[PDB]
Subunit: 282 residues, 3 copies
Amino acid sequence: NGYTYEDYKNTAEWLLSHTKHRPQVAIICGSGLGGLTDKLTQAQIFDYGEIPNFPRSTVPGHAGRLVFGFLNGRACVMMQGRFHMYEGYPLWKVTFPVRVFHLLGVDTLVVTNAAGGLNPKFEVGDIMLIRDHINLPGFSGQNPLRGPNDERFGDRFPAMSDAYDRTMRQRALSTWKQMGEQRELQEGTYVMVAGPSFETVAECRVLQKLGADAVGMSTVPEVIVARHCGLRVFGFSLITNKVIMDYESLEKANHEEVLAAGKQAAQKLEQFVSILMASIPL
Amino acid sequence: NGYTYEDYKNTAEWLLSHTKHRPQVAIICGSGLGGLTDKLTQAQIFDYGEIPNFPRSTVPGHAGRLVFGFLNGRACVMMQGRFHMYEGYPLWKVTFPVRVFHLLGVDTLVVTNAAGGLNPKFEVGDIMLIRDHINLPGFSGQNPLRGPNDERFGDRFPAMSDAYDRTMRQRALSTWKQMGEQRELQEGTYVMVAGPSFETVAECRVLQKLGADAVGMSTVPEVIVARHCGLRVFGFSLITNKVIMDYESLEKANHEEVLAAGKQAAQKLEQFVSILMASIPL
Amino acid sequence: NGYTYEDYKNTAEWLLSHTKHRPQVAIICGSGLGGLTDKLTQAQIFDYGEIPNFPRSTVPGHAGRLVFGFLNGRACVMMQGRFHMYEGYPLWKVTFPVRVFHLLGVDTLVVTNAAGGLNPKFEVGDIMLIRDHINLPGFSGQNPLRGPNDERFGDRFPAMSDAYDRTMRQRALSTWKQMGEQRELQEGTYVMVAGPSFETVAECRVLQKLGADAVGMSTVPEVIVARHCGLRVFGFSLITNKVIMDYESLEKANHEEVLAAGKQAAQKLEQFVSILMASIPL
Ligand SMILES: COc1ccc(/C=C/P(=O)(O)O)c(Sc2c[nH]c3c(=O)[nH]cnc23)c1
Ligand SMILES: COc1ccc(/C=C/P(=O)(O)O)c(Sc2c[nH]c3c(=O)[nH]cnc23)c1
Ligand SMILES: COc1ccc(/C=C/P(=O)(O)O)c(Sc2c[nH]c3c(=O)[nH]cnc23)c1
Ligand SMILES: [Cl-]
Ligand SMILES: [Cl-]
Ligand SMILES: [Cl-]
Ligand SMILES: [Cl-]
Ligand SMILES: [Cl-]
Ligand SMILES: [Cl-]
Ligand SMILES: [Cl-]
Ligand SMILES: [Cl-]
Ligand SMILES: [Cl-]
């Protein structure tokens, strides 16, 4: 980890210096929450590059931007653009933003993400509340707390059995009925895999047998350092596809079908998140 | 990854400069395909050292050599000597050769390897067609596509559900009957483990329960970058041993028994591969 | 690995130079064997810092010390203070001490450790003999033999199916009856996880389903290089806690409950280890 506490403080302070927005809720926007920044009243945009010590993607395609504003009368900081293991970032860079959020005094993290369905009852376009995760990289050493622990963030050995807030999740089932959606809001376990290649069938069978309902390539490191900092955490996945679980199928997973499911669910997801701000305790 | 596209191009071009052999098929020779170079008509040998940007083993024992020639009227490039995680090589070095093969315009990769039997119906000397793999290192971040993606090789998020060509595998069952072998050609799932230590019993039970038929320490990274480049992929394992699956046995696995099974199956394996060239589409 | 054989030799020799103690048995003291050094007759203490090439913890809290002496008429070298992946140490540093022990001509390693119960028949304060391990990090590349092999320590591909000595374990069940403990000495499989965060429920269910009886964050790398060097290996775990395996519980694991179970079992553990020296073959 090439970041000191002084580095985190510098970034927090610089942002406090450069905006009057004091946010309570951080949202990391995954697949098809691109345009959720269009619903922030009183939006102030930073490009990651301007923000100090802030990782910037080398890849030309994505210019990640941090946006401060109000959503449904909640002070929010949104991340449009995320860092993934598969891109080559170490986890002390992937999760750098969360430690800054805390130093802004944000108390709640919303995390969204795409995922393949491993639970057969799941369908494309479905939304799965993250109740638990399986951190497969963490088992092997790839945990974002690996290294010296700073008491000023949290304990050396934080628990995670409770990472995903029970209350937020109930209050999210309620909001669904109010949305009057045709399809029931799902609840399940998200397994993180590093990727970037899609799963084999033997691999998909391993993940289903380990007890995973969805597989994606993000979120878990962010949840772990959020819980390490004492943040309340709520997250869901967009079920972008059904993980091919048999050799008889003649169908390959693909990024296009993930972009598609993401453009298709944008409106629904943007709505659900903004109504949800109301159920976020102040 | 300390290799640019210009580096790969340089190696490809240098080889094109230094041989008139334009190969269609690359074969990576695992356990007991040492002498398969003796069956190349019109053989031109390179030591890895001569070949630019080509990883060279530090270990005194193995002087890896790349050999261009014809096998059963197929233009082949053979790798005699392979790079393994356990040796300390990063995967961008293990799989460096495959990216060069593609730049030579090779369209088909044959991958052979030793493996311990986890499926009880398997016996030493058996041959298992790789139908699927379980990439246990890949889950944790150790995937050879981790880092920036180059469009000139393939897509950022390639699928693998179809990695092992269906046609090649049928056409391989047919060739077996023509060989008139006493023992039926096997088909199964290969789990890669980094090693170099052999599995415990609890470990062997984990791998059987995950759905693996054989365990070895290679191949999978090569298959992933081959499929990333659009290469057709066919592979099998020599079942060198039966993974000790109970505490009551007084038998340890050992490298000697792997070298043995390899010397013992050489002839059979050398035959099977050369007949197989005929079934390789031009 | 930034250690040569000359480095290991230098450390061994320096210790031989600086003590008349020629030890047969190395003990790595885990949770609640702090005070086991108080039972060494004729104790000679080294701070790790004094000992050359010896890793030293950056963290202010723990000043690791190596102590030579006699326990129950056995020449022992004890490690008070251990190195863990979660602290950031690479495994060539975690296991550095074991290679030195061998060069002192120690023939037997005792390894102790805390662990969460995954087997429901287990209770806090219980003692589980390690019969086998599941090395989850090793699968992904994080094995301490990864790199060039030195013949002077052992074989490139050591077996582990037999890592935990059968005889020592019988002779340990016998000593239990002589101790006349109210609770039966347990026997099981220890899964290593890198941590430092505690397991989720989905995670705890994965580890139980893989066949693990206890989960801890140490030992396995030490056992692997000990067995690579030809050392006889015996180990047990203190069951510090029962891994939360359901969402209905309102209980988080915590370090305090691990320190507690450790202070509470110290006397019992200190006794068991010193009686055990008698059953150690000379
Ligand atoms: C491979 O293409 C991608 C690219 C990006 C993401 C997620 C980015 P995020 O929204 O978390 O910020 C995913 S997630 C994903 C959907 N379907 C699958 C699948 O079948 N397997 C494993 N993972 C996924 C997949
Ligand atoms: C440990 O000794 C070796 C050395 C080299 C190889 C493979 C080299 P390749 O032919 O892929 O290029 C193997 S593979 C192997 C056979 N039996 C087992 C086993 O029981 N467990 C896990 N793996 C193996 C094992
Ligand atoms: C998280 O806090 C710690 C700190 C140190 C250790 C071990 C050090 P050692 O004695 O091996 O030298 C453990 S081990 C441990 C007990 N309960 C659990 C649990 O529930 N999960 C996973 N692991 C543990 C846990
Ligand atoms: Cl930079
Ligand atoms: Cl990295
Ligand atoms: Cl890293
Ligand atoms: Cl070099
Ligand atoms: Cl490496
Ligand atoms: Cl590496
Ligand atoms: Cl130092
Ligand atoms: Cl490291
Ligand atoms: Cl490391």
